[PDB]
Write a protein that holds these residues in place. Sequence first.
Motif, PDB file in Angstrom:
ATOM      1  N   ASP A 211       4.678  27.819   8.278  1.00  6.23           N
ATOM      2  CA  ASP A 211       4.335  26.526   7.635  1.00  6.23           C
ATOM      3  C   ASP A 211       3.164  25.948   8.401  1.00  6.23           C
ATOM      4  O   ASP A 211       3.229  24.848   8.922  1.00  6.23           O
ATOM      5  N   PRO A 212       2.023  26.695   8.446  1.00  5.79           N
ATOM      6  CA  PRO A 212       0.931  26.177   9.297  1.00  5.79           C
ATOM      7  C   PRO A 212       0.324  24.856   8.791  1.00  5.79           C
ATOM      8  O   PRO A 212      -0.081  24.010   9.587  1.00  5.79           O
TER       9      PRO A 212
ATOM     10  N   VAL B 180       0.299  22.874  -4.548  1.00  4.08           N
ATOM     11  CA  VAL B 180       0.238  23.394  -3.178  1.00  4.08           C
ATOM     12  C   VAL B 180       1.602  23.285  -2.460  1.00  4.08           C
ATOM     13  O   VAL B 180       1.958  24.138  -1.620  1.00  4.08           O
ATOM     14  N   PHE B 181       2.342  22.230  -2.781  1.00  2.21           N
ATOM     15  CA  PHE B 181       3.651  22.081  -2.166  1.00  2.21           C
ATOM     16  C   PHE B 181       4.624  23.155  -2.563  1.00  2.21           C
ATOM     17  O   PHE B 181       5.331  23.725  -1.683  1.00  2.21           O
ATOM     18  N   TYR B 182       4.774  23.370  -3.866  1.00  2.00           N
ATOM     19  CA  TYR B 182       5.676  24.413  -4.358  1.00  2.00           C
ATOM     20  C   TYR B 182       5.292  25.769  -3.793  1.00  2.00           C
ATOM     21  O   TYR B 182       6.143  26.546  -3.306  1.00  2.00           O
TER      22      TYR B 182
ATOM     23  N   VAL C  55       7.433  28.625  -1.539  1.00  2.00           N
ATOM     24  CA  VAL C  55       7.665  29.977  -1.866  1.00  2.00           C
ATOM     25  C   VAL C  55       7.296  30.855  -0.653  1.00  2.00           C
ATOM     26  O   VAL C  55       8.070  31.768  -0.294  1.00  2.00           O
ATOM     27  N   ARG C  56       6.137  30.598  -0.073  1.00  2.00           N
ATOM     28  CA  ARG C  56       5.649  31.414   1.038  1.00  2.00           C
ATOM     29  C   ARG C  56       6.557  31.306   2.277  1.00  2.00           C
ATOM     30  O   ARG C  56       6.850  32.331   2.949  1.00  2.00           O
ATOM     31  N   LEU C  57       7.030  30.100   2.540  1.00  2.00           N
ATOM     32  CA  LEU C  57       8.013  29.855   3.620  1.00  2.00           C
ATOM     33  C   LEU C  57       9.319  30.584   3.388  1.00  2.00           C
ATOM     34  O   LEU C  57       9.833  31.230   4.308  1.00  2.00           O
ATOM     35  N   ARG C  58       9.849  30.538   2.158  1.00  2.00           N
ATOM     36  CA  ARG C  58      11.041  31.275   1.788  1.00  2.00           C
ATOM     37  C   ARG C  58      10.880  32.811   2.030  1.00  2.00           C
ATOM     38  O   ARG C  58      11.754  33.502   2.653  1.00  2.00           O
TER      39      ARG C  58
ATOM     40  N   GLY D 155      12.649  34.738   5.188  1.00  2.00           N
ATOM     41  CA  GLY D 155      13.709  35.722   4.831  1.00  2.00           C
ATOM     42  C   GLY D 155      13.791  36.841   5.864  1.00  2.00           C
ATOM     43  O   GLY D 155      14.870  37.217   6.315  1.00  2.00           O
ATOM     44  N   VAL D 156      12.619  37.303   6.274  1.00  2.00           N
ATOM     45  CA  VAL D 156      12.471  38.361   7.290  1.00  2.00           C
ATOM     46  C   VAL D 156      13.146  37.965   8.616  1.00  2.00           C
ATOM     47  O   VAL D 156      13.902  38.742   9.193  1.00  2.00           O
ATOM     48  N   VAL D 157      12.844  36.750   9.067  1.00  2.00           N
ATOM     49  CA  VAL D 157      13.299  36.212  10.334  1.00  2.00           C
ATOM     50  C   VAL D 157      14.807  35.998  10.307  1.00  2.00           C
ATOM     51  O   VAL D 157      15.531  36.278  11.274  1.00  2.00           O
TER      52      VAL D 157
END
Length: 121
Positions: A29-30, A94-96, A100-103, A107-109
Amino acid sequence: SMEQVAMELRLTELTRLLRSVLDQLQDKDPARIFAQPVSLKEVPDYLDHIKHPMDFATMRKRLEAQGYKNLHEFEEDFDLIIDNCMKYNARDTVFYRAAVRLRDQGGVVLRQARREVDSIG
């Protein structure tokens, strides 16, 4: 009791591992879209839409009070961050997209954190 101490040490070590997980997720979440609570001064209708607001600062306060008893509880709060955003904001925003990118990356982590929590106990 010594049993209460041992349980407290397990909670402390879970807290350690969740702090690391939280740091890793927050790096995905940069833009810092999820860093702080949605402002009710700036989005006065928010609570009409979203019943259980969440953000990384609020998770960090709970974590530092050793308020997560297990990984499930911590993942619930992470999921609220993502899910709240994906409801309030439209798909073309941009928020949505940030959610998605954070999810996807989170998921990996979370997948390896579950293994570590099961593994170490």
